[PDB]
Write a protein that binds this ligand. Structure first.
Ligand SMILES: Cc1nc(C)c(C(=O)Nc2ccc(F)c(-c3nc4ncc(-c5ncccc5C)cn4n3)c2)o1
Lengths: 229, 202, 219, 206, 218, 214, 204, 206, 229
């Protein structure tokens, strides 16, 4: 499970994998971890699936009522605070890491990270899930703030493809969504079109010389690939 | 802890040591094991000192209330059932108390033992505590109904003294109380070592 | 226990406390934790005093046997190797964290052995319970190529940080200085906690404690 | 489990016998304590267990039967009713917070025709009752350690129509057997008998 | 998430509280650019070690109480010692519910001369000194502050105390695993608490004894 | 995480003829470090002639002090300004300690005060409330050091020498100072500075005494 | 645990040219006095005396081993084993079985016959030697004895005065302990003579 | 721990008394089994414990004493030697692989001057011996459950110079006390006495 | 603890951090995890320190004797096989991950990885230690085979500086060594000269807006940095 959100000028870009696994078996290979709360606020949920689904739908049911009552759009701080409160008074029973990202006309685009513990940190870019730790040292190197909308979604897809290539718990479709002043737009690039994969990476084409032929010299010359040879 | 009380023709005799050991360290050598509930009942303290003190003080409040309402002294059989119910309600909260209620109601003297699980027995010879196994030996072989008050008090004192001498959890000051129809009186209160050179001289 | 070692201009300076506690009670107030290994190798020890003394005496006799064999002075790498072999053979059950320091033809040498057998060679090392409060001082005050007086001030100060801020250490500062030729071991280099509120010497005129029967034996 | 309760029904009486042992971890507190508690004029209960649960449960049962008799103007209840009502408390206790009444009982009684219209049982009744709430009408039952030794003993010697004196001698045999084969000191045995006249404390055997 | 260590010291006229600006997730340095020093009311400031959610909730709950009390009624705002007392009572009350507020806090404040510096654990223990430190700063940093206090008990100066704060932050950086070299110093004087911009303390890694040949175990 | 902790320290009182000398060491230590050397949260004054000195966990005694102070204030408001006696305070404290019997306080307490006839008396409690009135007594990690020393100079047992005169304020103060200077040298958790409270009839006075800081 | 099974306490104090070693008398099984007349002291020669403490079976086993070894030493080497050699010997003996440890905690006192130097020692159960200049103590009443001694002892005590402090400390320390008592036995040994004294204690 | 061994020394004899109980978890296997094993003509041992360890340890000790007497041409060993040699096996067992001999013993004997040069002890000897290897010369000792009850009982009544008959009556008192205050069925007690004539099976008391 | 080895044309480049930690306390901040076995074969050791030190010195003592006996240089396969055998018959008792890298005239430069389990995989570049997992997605992006000697050591120092910046268990000096036909050359760049650090990275200069001033509007405007403001 890998989820991430990156903020740019206009709004935010959410990206995530699509695979729920039972430890070592792919239960669902086309899952959807980007849950909408409002029209312009989404959440990427990681950890357990039942707990985060209950939380997402409870908070979205709250947000629908607040917005109808006040009659004007909802900030992202509201939704992030609701999530933090809930995931804080259930912190012993649930294992739920949330990334709440959205756009409001007041403060532009915003990304909040609510980890397992239950805190709430408002960031410029957030990562989460079991396969995240492979992305930190990817963002420290290849990421610069102030990107455009298109280059942002390209970088997000690239980050997720580098995260689920090495991680076992992650994989499948790459699902991204862009939230900004215009309509929120979605995109799902499959695995057979991903911007990276360790099978098509030409540095992993030549194999490790492990099966040495029974030979007379100590020169290593590659594997033994047939019985005659 | 060593506590004993036996019934004879002439009343009830209670006798106690005065030491409270917290494992291997001696907290004090002057604990008062006989908690005079009222002017007519005697309760003894064995086990958890906190639990015994608290619940016997509650029982001494309830006996006084009974006397106020009906205008007559409470009897031992009912004053002992109060404590048995109190203790049995908390049989699963980890109390540790075994006490002996000894009194002289309008049916002659009565002596009950009330445990920490609600047990409530009526016999004429009890000795509770950790050194109890040393009292019985010297208590069973000298006890008989027709003892003179001084002879029976001496039996109780010489029986506690032998429990203080062989056991590491008992000792201090041996004290002997007497329960007769008029109330109760502290017979004697003597150090455990001044007794040693009085029973085994030379 | 708090042992520190500082490599200075020419030689090394080792320091330790003196208080030895046997299970939350100060047993002795002037125990000595700077053992002897060779004419030019000293070895402070922390942890269980049993093993700290046992392994130190063992390898200290072995080094003496060896230098009688060869005839040369003994090298600190030999002592360090013997100690680490013995300690690793027992998987840390021999719980003695040692600070081994000497002077060779290769210049000073100061290493530390964890109870599991791992060794580190550093400019300064600290072991014991107050090893975190003493190291805090050395990091803040260690400059390179210090003179002997500066190394001794620094070791005394680094010990007085474990003396006052750790319960399992204190009452004195042992400071030994090793050079190429000599090795001078001053025991009471600093005694901060001085003897306050003098005793009242309660008087009991002989005889107050009764006696039953006495057999005196002349010799 | 230490204190054994023997009970057997004959034609015109029930006998029960309860070891009056009372102990503290190994110290004999007493060797004479009446463990056979009489409920009504024709019924008795032999309980075995710790003293706390035993006394509390028996007092509760006795008070409730007495109250019911008050609420019916001197109408005695039959033994099936008292047995089922004891069993109901014993059973509902194991699914409560305070837990089980760790006490096993033998309910003995003699059913007397209460009126002219009455057409119920006239004979004696014995009911074996476990601590979990089991309830079974038996010809003879035994509880505790010696429970086994005497049970076999009764299979060899019990007959449906033993008289009073042969009941006495059979109880003597079972009691001495329990004394001879159990490591626990069960010396005094407290024999009582239920007959159409009520309950009678048999003094000879012990 | 969990903060690092906090240290604090009283000088002649005010208080100084330094803390690194980093939140870790176990062994991973997650967020290196977040502010850990909060300030409550207009006289006091707080900083917590350990879990961040608990500090974030507790500081919010004691910052709602101050502003409401002052806004509803015409009363003076709570002094440092009283808002700290309320903090301590709330931590203890959360602990009795087996719902601990698992963070050791350091609390500073100044109100017209009476300068206050206290610390509170999570089990309910509270204390007050002329030098406080939580996390690993209680072992590494605190001895240095105590000696720098006792070497001149008349009272440090502001610069003479900032110096030793830098000298202890340096060692905390050296010897604490989960720490980074970007700290913040909240300075509380009579006017009021004032948080400084992040700064870095210089280090030294060029001892000769660290050379490749010497540290070698061949 | 366990909700308990032992913050060391020690206290010790000696009751005299018309006074009581209470003493508590001012030192607070946490898990392995040393929080403070100026901890004054041991000896808490309830009424002008009564004090409670408690050791153990620090949060629990800071809580129990407030509970006792409010109970004393209620007693004072209901009884028309009548400040309770030492005996009443001691019984009240036992009752309070036993109510929290299943999630107890981790304190060991002493209610030190003056009786009605003027004589001074001390009380000593366990963790659950086993009170016992007595004439001296020490609690804390340094109990088994100080107790047998006082047992030997006050009770004057095991000495075939006629009992000395009754000890006054100065002599008792010096004896307790001896005991604390001796316990500060063999216990690792005891002694940075001790505070003495001399409770007499014309009010109370207070003194400090400095120990080794190691 | 296992070291407080049999009870017992020993304590040694150094005078000027002398020293006194005193032990309790009680032998029990963790609460119940088996016997009330067993001292803990063993004399090896006219200048050494040591006392063991711990489990009683290991006290006796170790005393047999130490006597075996001392008699063997006096045979091979024609001389009385000195104090320091004796302490180092039993330290090595204890550390040999380091993972099968003996449950003793010996307490050695010794004096140089002509030189006049006193020497005390008190090892742990795993061999850690600890030689102070004033006094040692071991057993169930360790802390109480420490407390009494650190207050009663002073540098230059004479024999007839040192015996007083020793007796008073042992009595007042065993009074606050449930696993010691029943009188005491003391041995005050000097350069010229060795004296044994039984000390009346509480029969508690 | 169930079976009690009482033993007390007087001026010119030792008495021991061993409850002959033998049980299986609560079933009395037997109430008469001789637990007092004679080693030499003037020495005996009262062991208490499980039957396996008891019989094996006693047979081992007896065979080794017999062999030693063979290797010395009819030279009897004193009681200190046999006591220390028993203690040595008991003690070395707790640091072996097979573990402790879970058996507690009372060694009784009467030391006789073996020759004209002999100047050893002439009186009787009693040695209390724990299972861990403790060894203590006592005036009277007791093992098992009743061990406490009688020990106190002996402090009140034992005198250094009781005769044979007062020893009989004191043993009767202690035995009846053990029977009256212990929950375990210790009915038959197997009293033996060691005197300058050897060992004598006292039949009266039990 | 982060260690790595990268192979180029001539030989290999070993890089590692220098910090041994007791969980959360820096025991030794100038350690040396590059242990020489022969003149031209080195090993980077990770995991426990006692076990890997005993293994390194035992294997080097073996290698010194084999080379003296045969009289000619030792391959890297020999040392890697010895390590694999030892770390395999102690696999239950030790936690020791080794990277054996060297140069022999026969097969050029070689790098073998012997993980915790005890296998032995001959690779083109190896990573190891607790802080390694941050480097995989760094090598998949910024690494191309066929580098030169200087660019290789630059890339190795950069990788280690990106690994110990985010990892808590790693840090301190960066110690590299180059093994090739010429003399083996060492280098230790301190922390105050590292090619990367999250304090001097200008995207981590502006702080998270966490301490909002008590305000009247829902516009986010940064933290509260003073009492007056
Ligand atoms: C009729 C009758 N016959 C007997 C023999 C008894 C009896 O034993 N009743 C009883 C009931 C409840 C108790 F809780 C106790 C009781 N007495 C004690 N004395 C001392 C210590 C102790 N103190 C400090 C440290 C260690 C210990 C073991 C513990 N306990 N527990 C005793 O009743």
């Amino acid at each position: 499970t890998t989820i991430l959100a990156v903020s740019y000028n206009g709004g935010v870009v959410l990206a995530a994998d699509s695979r729920t696994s039972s430890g070592t078996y792919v239960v669902n290979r086309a899952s959807n971890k980007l849950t909408k709360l409002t029209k312009k606020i989404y959440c990427c949920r990681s950890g357990s699936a039942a707990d985060t689904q209950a939380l997402a739908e409870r908070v979205s049911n709250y947000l629908g009522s607040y917005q109808t009552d006040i009659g004007a759009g909802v900030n992202v701080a509201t939704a992030a605070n609701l999530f933090q409160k809930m995931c804080y008074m259930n912190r012993w029973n649930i294992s739920a890491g949330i990334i709440v990202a959205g756009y409001d006309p007041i403060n532009g685009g915003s990304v909040y990270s609510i980890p397992s513990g239950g805190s709430c940190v408002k960031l410029d870019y957030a990562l989460g899930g079991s396969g995240s730790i492979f992305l930190y040292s990817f963002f420290d190197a290849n990421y610069k703030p102030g990107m455009s909308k298109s280059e942002c979604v390209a970088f997000c897809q690239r980050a997720v493809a580098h995260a689920y290539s090495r991680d076992g718990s992650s994989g499948g479709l790459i699902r991204t969504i862009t939230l900004d002043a215009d309509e929120p737009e979605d995109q799902t690039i499959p695995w057979n079109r991903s911007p990276y994969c360790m099978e098509k990476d030409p540095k992993y084409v030549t194999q490790a010389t492990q099966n040495q032929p029974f030979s007379s010299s100590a020169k290593i010359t590659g594997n033994r690939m047939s019985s005659t040879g | 802890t060593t506590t004993l009380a036996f019934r004879f023709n002439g009343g009830i005799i209670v006798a106690v040591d005065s030491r409270a050991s917290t494992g291997q360290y001696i907290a004090s050598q002057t604990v008062m094991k006989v908690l005079e509930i009222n002017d007519y009942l005697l309760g003894t303290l064995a086990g958890g000192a906190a639990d015994c003190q608290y619940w016997e003080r509650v029982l001494g409040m309830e006996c006084r209330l009974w006397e106020l309402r009906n205008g007559s002294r409470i009897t031992v059989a009912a004053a002992s059932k109060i404590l048995a119910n109190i203790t049995y309600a908390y049989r699963n909260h980890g109390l540790s108390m075994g006490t002996m209620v000894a009194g002289w109601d309008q049916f002659g003297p009565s002596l009950y033992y009330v445990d920490d699980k609600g047990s409530r027995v009526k016999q004429d010879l009890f000795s509770v505590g950790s050194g109890s196994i040393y009292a019985y030996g010297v208590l069973d072989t000298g006890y008989r109904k027709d003892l003179s008050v001084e002879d029976a008090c001496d039996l109780a004192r010489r029986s506690i003294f032998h429990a203080t001498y062989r056991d590491g959890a008992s000792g201090g000051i041996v004290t002997v109380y007497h329960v007769h129809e008029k109330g109760w009186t502290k017979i004697s209160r003597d150090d455990q070592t001044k007794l040693y050179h009085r029973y085994f001289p030379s | 226990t708090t042992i520190v070692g500082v490599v200075y201009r020419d030689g090394v300076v080792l320091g330790a406390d003196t208080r030895a506690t046997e299970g939350s009670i100060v047993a002795d107030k002037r125990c000595r934790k700077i053992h002897y290994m060779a004419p030019n190798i000293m070895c402070c020890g922390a942890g269980t005093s049993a093993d700290t003394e046992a392994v130190t005496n063992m390898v200290s006799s072995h080094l003496a046997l060896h230098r009688l064999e060869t005839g040369k002075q003994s090298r600190v790498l030999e002592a360090l190797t013997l100690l680490k072999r013995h300690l690793y053979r027992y998987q840390g059950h021999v719980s003695a964290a040692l600070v081994l320091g000497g002077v060779d033809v290769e210049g000073p040498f100061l290493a530390t052995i964890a109870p599991h057998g791992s060794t580190d060679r550093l400019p300064f090392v600290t072991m014991g319970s107050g090893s975190i409060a003493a190291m805090a001082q050395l990091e803040a005050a260690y400059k390179d190529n210090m003179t002997c007086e500066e190394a001794k001030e620094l070791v005394a100060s680094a010990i007085r940080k474990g003396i006052f801020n750790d319960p399992y250490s204190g009452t004195q500062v042992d400071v030994c200085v090793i050079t190429k030729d000599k090795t001078e071991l001053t025991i009471g280099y600093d005694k901060p906690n001085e003897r306050m509120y003098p005793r009242q010497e309660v008087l009991l005129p002989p005889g107050t404690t009764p006696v039953l029967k006495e057999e005196i034996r002349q010799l | 489990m230490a204190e054994t309760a023997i009970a057997f029904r004959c034609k015109d009486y029930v006998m029960v016998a309860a070891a009056g042992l009372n102990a503290f971890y190994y110290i004999k507190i007493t060797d004479a304590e009446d463990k056979i508690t009489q409920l009504d004029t024709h019924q008795l209960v032999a309980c075995t267990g710790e003293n706390g649960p035993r006394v509390n449960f028996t007092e509760y049962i006795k008070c409730n039967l007495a109250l019911n008799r008050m609420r019916q103007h001197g109408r005695h209840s039959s033994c099936e009713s008292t047995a089922n009502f004891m069993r109901n408390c014993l059973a509902s206790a194991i699914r409560s917070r305070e837990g089980a009444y760790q006490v096993n009982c033998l309910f003995a009684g003699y059913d007397t025709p209460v009126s002219e219209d009455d057409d119920g049982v006239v004979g004696p009744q014995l009911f074996y009752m476990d601590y979990l709430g089991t309830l079974q009408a038996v010809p003879y039952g035994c509880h505790g350690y010696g429970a086994c030794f005497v049970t076999a003993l009764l299979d060899r010697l019990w007959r449906p129509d033993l008289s009073q004196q042969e009941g006495l001698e059979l109880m003597q045999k079972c009691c001495d057997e329990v004394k001879r084969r159990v490591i626990i000191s069960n010396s005094y045995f407290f024999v009582k008998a239920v007959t159409k006249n009520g309950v009678e404390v048999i003094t000879a055997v012990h | 998430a969990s903060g690092g260590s906090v240290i604090a010291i009283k000088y002649k006229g005010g208080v100084l509280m330094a803390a690194d600006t980093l939140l870790s997730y176990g062994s991973l340095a997650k967020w290196p650019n977040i502010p850990r020093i909060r300030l409550l009311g207009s006289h006091s400031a707080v900083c917590a070690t350990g879990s961040y959610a608990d500090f974030q909730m507790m500081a919010k709950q004691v910052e709602d109480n101050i502003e409401r009390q002052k806004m509803y009624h015409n009363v003076d705002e709570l002094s440092p010692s009283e808002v700290f007392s309320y903090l301590h009572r709330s931590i203890y009350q959360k602990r009795c519910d087996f719902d601990p507020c698992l963070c050791q806090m350091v609390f500073i404040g100044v109100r017209d001369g009476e300068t206050f510096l206290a610390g509170v654990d999570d089990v309910g223990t509270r204390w007050e000194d002329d030098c406080i430190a939580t996390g690993y700063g209680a072992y590494i940093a605190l001895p240095l502050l105590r000696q720098a206090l006792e070497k001149n008990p008349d009272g440090l100066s502001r610069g003479e105390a900032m110096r030793i704060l830098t000298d202890c932050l340096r060692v905390l950086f050296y010897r604490e695993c989960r720490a980074i070299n970007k700290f913040q110093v909240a300075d509380a004087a009579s006017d009021g608490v004032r948080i400084s911009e992040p700064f870095d303390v210089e280090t030294h890694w060029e001892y000769e004894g660290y050379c490749f040949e010497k540290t070698a175990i061949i | 995480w366990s909700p308990y902790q032992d913050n060391g320290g020690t206290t010790a009182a000696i009751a005299g003829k018309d006074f009581v000398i209470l003493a508590g060491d001012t030192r607070l230590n946490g898990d392995f470090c040393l929080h403070s050397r100026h901890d004054q949260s041991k000896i808490f004054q309830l009424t002008p002639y009564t004090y409670m000195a408690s050791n153990g966990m620090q949060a629990d005694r800071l809580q129990l002090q407030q509970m006792l102070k409010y109970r004393v204030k209620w007693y004072k408001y209901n009884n028309g300004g009548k400040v309770p006696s030492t005996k009443a305070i001691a019984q009240l404290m036992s009752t309070m300690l036993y109510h929290r019997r299943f999630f107890p306080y981790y304190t060991f307490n002493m209610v030190v005060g003056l009786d009605e006839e003027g004589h001074g008396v001390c009380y000593s409690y366990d963790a659950v409330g086993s009170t016992e009135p007595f004439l001296y007594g020490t609690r804390g990690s340094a109990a088994s050091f100080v107790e047998p020393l006082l047992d030997c100079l006050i009770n004057r047992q095991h000495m075939t020498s006629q009992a000395p005169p009754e000890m006054t304020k100065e002599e008792t103060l010096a004896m307790l100072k001896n005991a604390f200077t001796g316990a500060a040298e063999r216990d690792i958790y005891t002694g940075d500075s001790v505070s003495f409270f001399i409770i007499t009839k014309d009010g109370v006075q207070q003194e400090s005494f400095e120990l080794r800081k190691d | 645990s296992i070291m407080a099974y049999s009870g017992g306490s020993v304590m040694a104090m150094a005078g000027k040219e002398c020293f006194v070693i005193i032990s309790d008398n009680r032998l029990g099984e963790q609460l119940k006095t088996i016997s009330t007349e067993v001292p803990k002291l063993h004399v090896v020669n006219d200048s050494i005396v040591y006392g063991l403490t711990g489990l009683r079976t290991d006290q006796q086993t170790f005393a047999n081993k130490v006597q075996f070894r001392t008699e063997m030493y006096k045979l091979r080497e024609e001389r009385d084993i000195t104090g320091k050699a004796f302490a180092a010997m039993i330290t090595s003996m204890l550390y040999e079985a380091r993972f099968g440890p003996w449950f003793v905690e010996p307490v050695i006192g010794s004096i140089d016959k002509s030189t006049g130097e006193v020497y005390l020692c008190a090892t742990d159960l795993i061999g850690a030697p600890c030689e102070p200049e004033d006094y040692v103590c071991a057993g169930t009443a360790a802390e109480s004895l420490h407390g009494m001694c650190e207050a009663l002892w002073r540098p230059g005590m004479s024999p007839e005065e040192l015996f007083e402090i020793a007796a008073q400390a042992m009595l007042s320390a065993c009074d606050r302990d449930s696993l010691s008592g029943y009188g005491a036995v003391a041995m005050i040994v000097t350069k010229d003579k060795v004296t044994t004294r039984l000390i009346k204690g509480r029969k508690d």
